[PDB]
Design a protein around this ligand. Sequence first.
Ligand code: POV
Ligand code: POV
Ligand code: POV
Ligand code: POV
Ligand code: POV
Ligand code: POV
Ligand code: POV
Ligand code: POV
Ligand code: Y01
Ligand code: Y01
Ligand code: Y01
Ligand code: Y01
Ligand code: Y01
Ligand code: Y01
Lengths: 610, 610
Amino acid sequence: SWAQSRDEQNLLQQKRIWESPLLLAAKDNDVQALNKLLKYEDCKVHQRGAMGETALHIAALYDNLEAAMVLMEAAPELVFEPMTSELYEGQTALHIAVVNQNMNLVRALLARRASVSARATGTAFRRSPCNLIYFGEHPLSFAACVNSEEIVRLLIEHGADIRAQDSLGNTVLHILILQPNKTFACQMYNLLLSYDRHGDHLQPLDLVPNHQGLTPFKLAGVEGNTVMFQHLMQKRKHTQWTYGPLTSTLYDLTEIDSSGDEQSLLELIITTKKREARQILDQTPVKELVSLKWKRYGRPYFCMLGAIYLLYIICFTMCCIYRPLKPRTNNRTSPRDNTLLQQKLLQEAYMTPKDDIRLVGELVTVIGAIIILLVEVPDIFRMGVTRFFGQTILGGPFHVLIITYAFMVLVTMVMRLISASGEVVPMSFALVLGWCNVMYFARGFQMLGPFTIMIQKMIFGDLMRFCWLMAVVILGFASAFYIIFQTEDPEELGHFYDYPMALFSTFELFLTIIDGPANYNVDLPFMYSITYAAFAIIATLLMLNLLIAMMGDTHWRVAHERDELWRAQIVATTVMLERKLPRCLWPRSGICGREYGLGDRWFLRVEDRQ
Amino acid sequence: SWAQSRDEQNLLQQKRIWESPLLLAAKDNDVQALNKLLKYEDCKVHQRGAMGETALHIAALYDNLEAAMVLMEAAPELVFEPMTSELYEGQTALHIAVVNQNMNLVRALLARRASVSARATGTAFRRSPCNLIYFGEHPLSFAACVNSEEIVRLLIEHGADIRAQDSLGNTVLHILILQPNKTFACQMYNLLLSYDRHGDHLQPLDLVPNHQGLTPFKLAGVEGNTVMFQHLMQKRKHTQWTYGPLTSTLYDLTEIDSSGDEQSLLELIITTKKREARQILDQTPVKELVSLKWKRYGRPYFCMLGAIYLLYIICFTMCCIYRPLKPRTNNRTSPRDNTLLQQKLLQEAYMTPKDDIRLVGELVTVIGAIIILLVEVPDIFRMGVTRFFGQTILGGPFHVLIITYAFMVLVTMVMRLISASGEVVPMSFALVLGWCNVMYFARGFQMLGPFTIMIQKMIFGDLMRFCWLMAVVILGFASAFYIIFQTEDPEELGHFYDYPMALFSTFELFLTIIDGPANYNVDLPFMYSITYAAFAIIATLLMLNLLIAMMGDTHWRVAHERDELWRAQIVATTVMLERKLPRCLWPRSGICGREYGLGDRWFLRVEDRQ
Ligand SMILES: CCCCCCCC/C=C/CCCCCCCC(=O)O[C@@H](COC(=O)CCCCCCCCCCCCCCC)COP(=O)([O-])OCC[N+](C)(C)C
Ligand SMILES: CCCCCCCC/C=C/CCCCCCCC(=O)O[C@@H](COC(=O)CCCCCCCCCCCCCCC)COP(=O)([O-])OCC[N+](C)(C)C
Ligand SMILES: CCCCCCCC/C=C/CCCCCCCC(=O)O[C@@H](COC(=O)CCCCCCCCCCCCCCC)COP(=O)([O-])OCC[N+](C)(C)C
Ligand SMILES: CCCCCCCC/C=C/CCCCCCCC(=O)O[C@@H](COC(=O)CCCCCCCCCCCCCCC)COP(=O)([O-])OCC[N+](C)(C)C
Ligand SMILES: CCCCCCCC/C=C\CCCCCCCC(=O)O[C@@H](COC(=O)CCCCCCCCCCCCCCC)COP(=O)([O-])OCC[N+](C)(C)C
Ligand SMILES: CCCCCCCC/C=C\CCCCCCCC(=O)O[C@@H](COC(=O)CCCCCCCCCCCCCCC)COP(=O)([O-])OCC[N+](C)(C)C
Ligand SMILES: CCCCCCCC/C=C\CCCCCCCC(=O)O[C@@H](COC(=O)CCCCCCCCCCCCCCC)COP(=O)([O-])OCC[N+](C)(C)C
Ligand SMILES: CCCCCCCC/C=C\CCCCCCCC(=O)O[C@@H](COC(=O)CCCCCCCCCCCCCCC)COP(=O)([O-])OCC[N+](C)(C)C
Ligand SMILES: CC(C)CCC[C@@H](C)[C@H]1CC[C@H]2[C@@H]3CC=C4C[C@@H](OC(=O)CCC(=O)O)CC[C@]4(C)[C@H]3CC[C@]12C
Ligand SMILES: CC(C)CCC[C@@H](C)[C@H]1CC[C@H]2[C@@H]3CC=C4C[C@@H](OC(=O)CCC(=O)O)CC[C@]4(C)[C@H]3CC[C@]12C
Ligand SMILES: CC(C)CCC[C@@H](C)[C@H]1CC[C@H]2[C@@H]3CC=C4C[C@@H](OC(=O)CCC(=O)O)CC[C@]4(C)[C@H]3CC[C@]12C
Ligand SMILES: CC(C)CCC[C@@H](C)[C@H]1CC[C@H]2[C@@H]3CC=C4C[C@@H](OC(=O)CCC(=O)O)CC[C@]4(C)[C@H]3CC[C@]12C
Ligand SMILES: CC(C)CCC[C@@H](C)[C@H]1CC[C@H]2[C@@H]3CC=C4C[C@@H](OC(=O)CCC(=O)O)CC[C@]4(C)[C@H]3CC[C@]12C
Ligand SMILES: CC(C)CCC[C@@H](C)[C@H]1CC[C@H]2[C@@H]3CC=C4C[C@@H](OC(=O)CCC(=O)O)CC[C@]4(C)[C@H]3CC[C@]12C
């Protein structure tokens, strides 16, 4: 609906240029007709186009130097005119000649005092998925993104402000990081810092943030721009000595490490959705910083929490095993009734010293369930209650499973206080969610770490993508199997005696975890052998080994990038383990340079061999 | 804790150089300030640094030739000064200028009679995982490891001892093998043998061992340095004739083959932990030596021991089958009691001539169990009782299984002598350990050989790495399944009737080796169908085919290097079969050159075609 509208304006621009002889003579290189048109009476010079454009805009848009000079002589006030549309707001011909890199025509307008500070605020210039270029809003921003070193020098001599910000707060150094040609953006980055030295108006140009707060150093890590990230560490490192093939380099760790309350560079890479940002983790000062925090304070504090959680789940498991049960007080209803025991009442549950030992174990699992919710739930109140916490749901799925576990413990606490029947259903969820959260503590081991990335990408990328075709085949054949055996005696072959059982039987015959139905003492119905032969070929052979072959490719892809997926689990673990543990037991990383004559900041030394 | 300490000294070195004007003028190339400082009164010349360094140490460390010459004129006694720290003990500036390769400044110190024999015994020079360079302790050792042919010639002219040894006993030829650039180390190896000819003080420089006993020939094979190993066989081979495209080369086999009581080169490659050393086995005189020892005396003596072991295990199997059993004398306790027979007493066991035939077979399996322990156990007494024999445990795991088998035979010997109940548990271990040791004798066949390397790397690299996540899922769902059926009648569905059975049932439902529980005559509990549907998706589909896909990659990696893993099993078999068989039936390999005019050593001839 939006691409349909701006295709209708680009064809309407071409109709207006074919109707007006003034606009048509500016498209072609026709100075013969522009002499004849402009010598007429009043000429209709300031007429609009379909884009709100003037005739001097067309001459700069089609690289017509000779047509533009005729218009500037005959009408000198066309230079100060912006486009008055919606999709090209504020754009002048001084914007257009910069992008088309017409060196003779930029000097021509600036001789006629063209504005170097007009703001091209149209929707064909905002950072959008619909726009193929994001150049900024200023002509100095336009010339930097087209790699024109001659015009960037020529604009600053005429007064182009280098510290100007667009609607996103981005300076020209922020926009050069967002450009697709990364090697040419490094040379233009150096050139724009050569001119920023003049009596600093605030903190310098590479230290000015945008409306997100990011500096050009932190923006290169959020956007995954690894080429610019290496280029901006050269300002931040410092070589101490060089002993033959040795080199001792001292790195900054100011905007990388967690200085204060702001988000550090490690927090912004884990949070962001662009998965190109996780290549910053392989770059040198960040790579030895993560290994330093994990081997010193990360891994000891993580293996303590993993061992306290095992003793909690073993204490929870034995309270479910020794739960209060008594023989049933009523009598059996049907011959299909299998039940022999039922739950004791609350006053009846605690009446012996062995129930007092269990009550100690039940208070441990209730208090531990509250401590989980005191740590996890106040994060949804600080962050956004639905959306901005839902970003952490797709990031860490073990946040959900331990809040759901702690919910299930307090449900069967309430169902114990009031004497409620059916505590087996909140317990059974809590046993399997309680134990399968021990697979969270497998990222402390590099070999066991990305096994849970395999289990995740097989469920949410293979099973949740192919089970819609399996459920189609189960519903087809279970409905067939149900009406075949609908006229029969279930006491011989009872796999399909009602419709919910025929769906659970066909799910189990799909996966080949119960045997195929057979009696051999009675004549089975005729359609059964034909249907089950057709079922066993498409379900058990073909579609079951489809899924096993799909999951075998998910295994191969995760095991290939086995090292860089584990080291991104450690950054997410170390960052989480700082924002919840108190500061007195987490020392700050690196060597502080107060009593070494280096300032107030916190350095990190790397020694290598070339 | 150790890297944190020597980061604090490298920043403290930079503070002391910024405080003293004498040290700061030696870091920069400032001969203007060194003229003004040294013309003062007493100047504080011999002040220390944070590394125990002098001002003449800084000038050599930062490549300041002009700053160093001012210091040597004004203070000529700074040349004889070592660093008095702990981490740079004994290092002088004559060490530093050699590593930085400053040719003008090495001649300057040696003109002022600098010591060419000072020992840099600091912990930044010991062979350690923490040190990135191991250059030795002498300036001749430093110049050889930086590939400076001009300084090695210049040091020997001033009296550098070429036979000097560091704290590890390594000469300069030992250290050149330990260097990472292998091609440049070959040219420096040749240069240092050109100077060692002067009236040999002992056996020559390439034949002097270190405190481990290794010569530079044997050190290249232990360290896996295959480039230096080819370069040092050129001294050891000898071309007999060249008949067109043919060439007859006669190889040495002095330090390669088992000469006396010392460990040969074949014994040191199998023993060592660096698995780069097994590429020496593909090099020509070692490769045809292993094939010669195996095809002549290795494989006949190995197939005799494999056939005697089959007849021993078949004789052990029939003594377990015909074991003494009688009907039970007591009466049944419970309806769950299944037992119908029990063991006979010792006086009752041997009372017929068919028991006398078994007694012959039981003496064979007792005597054979003692002979295993007389061969295997006295190896743990000669080697280190815990640690240095534990190196052979990780090397050969079939040493453990045949000592454990021989232990299990003598347990049920003792349990037969005293009439002890429960001989089925030491026998059942001994049947499966007895028969699965026949897979030891599968390396005699090249096709069957590395099948047991597959079985090993799947157990100790896939199963012992993923079963911690399976046991989490088994304990989760077996605890869920136990409390679901805890209120039921076990006589219909008894898979989970107590907690140890529910763990063995869930282990068997994981692996899909028993069928899923179903009755269809009774109403099963409601949570069972939901839990077993969740179990059968994550356990049987997803996590069971994870492990099968992991083991499929272990198969692919071992089958790729199928030839070089079998030929390393033959070296370990041939070496083991020499140190236990007597010398009269193992002839020495090669042709001895006594009556061929070649000396006392033992050659091996290889004929090839180019
Ligand atoms: C990888 C590392 C390895 C892990 C290994 C770890 C150990 C793993 C194994 C552990 C034990 C396994 C065997 C024990 C079985 C006997 C229990 C018992 O006697 O039950 C009694 C009740 O007791 C209960 O009801 C249990 C309640 C929870 C116990 C915790 C109490 C407070 C601990 C506070 C702090 C907790 C932790 C704090 C968390 C921060 C009564 O039962 P019974 O009448 O005697 O029944 C006997 C039946 N039988 C005769 C057939 C047997
Ligand atoms: C990926 C997930 C998909 C799940 C797939 C499997 C679903 C599993 C869900 C299981 C939930 C079970 C809850 C309790 C069941 C009781 C009610 C019942 O269903 O049976 C009732 C029957 O009534 C029916 O026949 C309903 C089935 C209609 C067609 C199926 C539509 C399913 C939605 C399609 C979605 C499309 C998805 C794929 C397309 C994109 C009563 O059973 P009865 O006792 O035998 O009474 C017979 C009376 N008689 C004796 C007179 C004859
Ligand atoms: C790849 C190569 C292929 C391998 C092939 C090799 C051969 C493989 C097969 C071999 C034989 C298989 C069939 C034999 C079954 C009859 C045995 C018997 O009669 O038992 C008798 C007792 O005998 C015993 O108790 C056995 C004790 C050990 C025997 C060794 C005696 C001393 C040998 C010293 C040196 C040993 C070696 C030294 C080691 C260095 C009594 O039993 P029974 O009352 O008669 O029971 C009959 C029941 N039935 C009627 C139903 C049947
Ligand atoms: C890789 C290897 C791992 C193996 C995993 C599987 C272990 C296999 C080991 C099997 C050994 C079995 C030996 C004999 C069993 C008898 C005692 C018993 O356990 O049952 C007793 C129950 O008491 C319990 O419930 C204990 C279980 C507590 C929680 C499990 C902790 C396991 C350690 C976690 C380690 C974490 C490792 C993963 C995390 C990294 C008695 O049973 P009962 O007769 O039914 O009495 C019920 C009384 N009732 C009737 C009143 C209700
Ligand atoms: C699916 C579930 C499976 C996963 C298990 C989850 C359940 C249990 C969770 C976690 C396990 C808890 C028990 C520890 C056992 C392993 C420890 C170990 O050997 O690691 C290191 C020793 O440790 C260190 O060198 C540094 C840490 C200090 C010791 C840990 C402190 C507390 C230990 C307990 C005191 C508790 C205090 C409170 C008392 C209750 C060895 O070095 P590594 O380098 O780490 O070697 C392998 C990693 N690698 C592959 C990277 C090379
Ligand atoms: C009380 C018990 C229930 C409640 C407890 C908590 C339950 C919920 C737990 C965790 C929920 C936390 C969020 C989901 C986790 C990952 C989602 C994600 O990352 O994006 C995913 C899409 O997006 C989705 O698929 C969203 C999930 C929709 C279905 C949720 C129900 C599945 C329950 C689970 C039951 C499943 C049946 C298994 C057997 C039972 C993409 O996945 P990916 O990993 O980013 O990459 C894989 C794609 N790739 C392969 C192409 C590369
Ligand atoms: C999991 C278990 C499976 C493994 C079986 C373990 C159990 C039994 C253990 C070992 C097997 C014992 C029986 C021998 C059968 C095979 C012999 C053979 O054919 O090999 C060679 C013949 O042999 C030779 O050419 C040289 C050796 C002389 C013959 C062996 C002497 C003793 C034979 C018995 C007298 C006993 C004396 C004491 C009396 C008791 C053939 O040449 P090859 O080159 O080797 O061909 C294949 C190898 N390749 C792939 C490299 C090309
Ligand atoms: C009486 C009956 C019991 C006693 C009899 C004797 C029992 C003990 C027998 C042989 C023991 C001899 C030493 C182990 C052999 C190999 C170890 C090794 O090489 O290093 C290993 C690590 O290091 C370890 O894992 C050490 C082993 C720890 C567990 C030991 C108990 C397992 C028992 C066994 C039961 C398992 C369950 C199976 C079904 C039962 C590394 O393995 P790798 O091969 O070097 O390379 C593979 C890694 N790769 C794939 C990444 C490349
Ligand atoms: C009553 C007493 C004796 C028992 C103590 C209970 C502990 C076992 C609980 C209390 C708080 C719990 C912690 C609360 C929050 C978290 C964060 C949680 O983080 C995630 O799940 C990250 C998700 C992801 O990144 O995928 C991991 C478990 C952990 C450390 C919990 C581990 C278990 C703890 C220590
Ligand atoms: C009583 C019955 C009906 C309960 C049903 C249990 C399931 C709903 C639970 C139990 C096991 C759980 C799984 C166990 C482990 C994982 C791996 C876990 O992996 C990650 O989060 C990887 C990400 C990372 O670590 O980087 C994602 C959730 C998931 C699939 C869990 C999803 C929810 C599952 C299937
Ligand atoms: C495609 C691969 C997996 C195998 C290829 C062979 C199949 C197509 C063949 C092998 C056995 C055949 C079946 C053998 C016997 C029967 C039973 C017959 O039905 C009855 O006699 C019903 C019994 C009754 O009415 O009591 C119908 C054909 C059918 C299913 C045959 C269908 C074709 C089958 C499955
Ligand atoms: C009483 C009489 C009639 C029976 C003879 C008993 C033999 C069958 C036994 C006695 C000593 C045993 C040997 C003792 C030691 C070894 C070394 C052993 O070496 C390893 O296991 C290497 C381990 C590895 O490299 O993995 C292999 C079996 C072998 C030859 C044994 C094979 C079986 C032997 C010959
Ligand atoms: C009665 C029951 C409980 C006994 C249990 C038996 C297991 C503990 C045994 C029987 C089979 C054995 C395995 C059989 C064969 C091998 C291959 C073997 O492989 C090698 O040593 C390869 C190295 C090489 O040859 O180069 C290592 C031991 C291993 C895994 C064994 C380990 C111990 C196992 C699992
Ligand atoms: C993911 C792939 C492997 C298959 C995708 C389809 C499944 C998600 C569907 C197919 C059959 C369905 C089951 C069909 C019948 C039942 C029984 C129903 O429980 C009962 O009726 C219990 C019986 C009783 O209480 O007596 C609960 C839903 C459940 C487990 C369904 C859960 C969803 C299942 C497993």
